[PDB]
Amino acid sequence: ASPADSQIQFTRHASDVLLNLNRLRSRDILTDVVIVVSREQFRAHKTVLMACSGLFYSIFTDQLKRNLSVINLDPEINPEGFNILLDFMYTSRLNLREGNIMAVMATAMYLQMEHVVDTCRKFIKAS
Amino acid sequence: ASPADSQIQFTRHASDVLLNLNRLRSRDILTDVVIVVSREQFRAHKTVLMACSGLFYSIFTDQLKRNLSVINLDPEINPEGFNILLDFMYTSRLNLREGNIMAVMATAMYLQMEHVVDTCRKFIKAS
Numbered sequence: 001a002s003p004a005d006s007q008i009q010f011t012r013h014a015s016d017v018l019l020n021l022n023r024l025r026s027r028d029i030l031t032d033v034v035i036v037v038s039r040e041q042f043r044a045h046k047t048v049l050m051a052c053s054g055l056f057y058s059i060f061t062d063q064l065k066r067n068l069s070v071i072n073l074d075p076e077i078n079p080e081g082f083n084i085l086l087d088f089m090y091t092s093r094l095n096l097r098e099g100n101i102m103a104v105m106a107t108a109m110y111l112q113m114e115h116v117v118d119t120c121r122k123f124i125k126a127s
Numbered sequence: 128a129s130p131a132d133s134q135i136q137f138t139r140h141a142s143d144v145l146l147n148l149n150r151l152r153s154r155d156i157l158t159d160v161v162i163v164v165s166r167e168q169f170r171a172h173k174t175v176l177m178a179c180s181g182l183f184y185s186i187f188t189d190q191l192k193r194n195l196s197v198i199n200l201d202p203e204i205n206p207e208g209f210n211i212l213l214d215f216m217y218t219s220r221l222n223l224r225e226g227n228i229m230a231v232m233a234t235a236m237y238l239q240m241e242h243v244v245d246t247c248r249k250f251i252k253a254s
C-alpha cells in the first residue's frame with residue numbers, strides 16, 4: 001500500500017483540472033443542470049456545484065433530488081452575484097467590487113460558501 | 128467587465144474542489160462511466176477523465192461516444208497501473224515505485240498523459 005503522503009506531488013494538477021472543467025463548461029460538454037436565477041439561467045456540472053457550495057451539496061446528495069436537471073434559486077437572488085460565484089467555483093478567482101460586494105456576499109450566504117462569506121467580510125473591513 | 132487577473136485569488140480552492148470530487152467518487156455520487164480494465168473495473172466522472180487524459184478527452188468530446196457508460200480499455204493495460212493513474216487524476220499525487228514504474232509509464236502513454244510520462248522518464252533517469 002502507498003500512503004498519498006509519500007507520493008510524487010504535481011503542484012499544478014488541481015488547477016489544470018479546474019481550468020479544463022471550466023473549458024468544458026464553456027462548450028456545454030457534460031453539463032447536467034441549469035440553474036435558473038430570475039430571468040437568467042446558467043448551465044453547470046453538478047459535481048462542481050457540490051464541491052463548492054453547501055446548498056448544492058445538500059440538494060444533490062439527497063437521492064430525492066440528485067437527478068434534477070433544473071434548479072430554481074430563490075427569486076431574491078441577484079443573477080450577477082450568482083454569476084460571479086459560479087465563475088469563482090470554476091476559476092478560484094473572485095470578482096469583488098464596491099458595486100457588487102453586498103449582492104455577492106448575500107448570494108454566498110445563500111449558497112453556503114463560508115470561506116467566500118468570510119472574504120466578503122474582510123473586503124468590507126478593508127473598505 | 129472584470130479580468131480574472133485582478134480578482135481575488137483563493138490559493139486552495141482548486142485543490143479543495145479536486146478533494147471533494149474524489150470524495151464524490153468514493154461514494155459513487157454522479158459517476159457516469161465504468162472503465163473496464165481486464166478483470167477489474169473502476170467508476171469515474173467523465174469530466175475528470177477528460178480533464179486529465181488525452182485519450183478520454185478524445186473519446187468523450189466526440190458526440191458519437193459522449194454518452195457511453197462503459198469503456199473497455201485495451202486488454203494489455205495493467206489494472207494496477209490504471210488504478211494508480213486514476214488516483215493521480217483525483218489527487219495530484221502519483222504513486223511511482225520501482226515495481227510499478229514500467230506499467231504506470233506504459234499506461235500513461237496509452238492514456239495520453241504527457242506530463243506524467245515525462246515524470247516517469249525522470250524517475251527512470253534517477254534510478
Ligand SMILES: Cn1cnc2c(ccn2CC(=O)Nc2ccncc2Cl)c1=O
Nearest residue numbers: 050051052053054057112113114147150
Ligand atoms: C458551509 N459549506 C458547506 N459545504 C461546502 C462549503 C464549501 C464547499 N462545500 C461543499 C462541500 O464541502 N462538498 C463536499 C463535501 C464532502 N464530500 C463531498 C463534497 Cl462534494 C462550505 O463553506
Ligand SMILES: Cn1cnc2c(ccn2CC(=O)Nc2ccncc2Cl)c1=O
Nearest residue numbers: 020023177178179180181184239240241
Ligand atoms: C497529451 N495530453 C492530452 N490531453 C491532456 C493531457 C493532460 C490533460 N489532457 C486533457 C485535456 O487537455 N483536456 C481538455 C482540454 C481542453 N478543453 C477541455 C479539456 Cl477537458 C495531455 O498530456
Ligand SMILES: [Cl-]
Nearest residue numbers: 028029030031
Ligand atoms: Cl454533453
Ligand SMILES: [Cl-]
Nearest residue numbers: 155156157158
Ligand atoms: Cl449518483
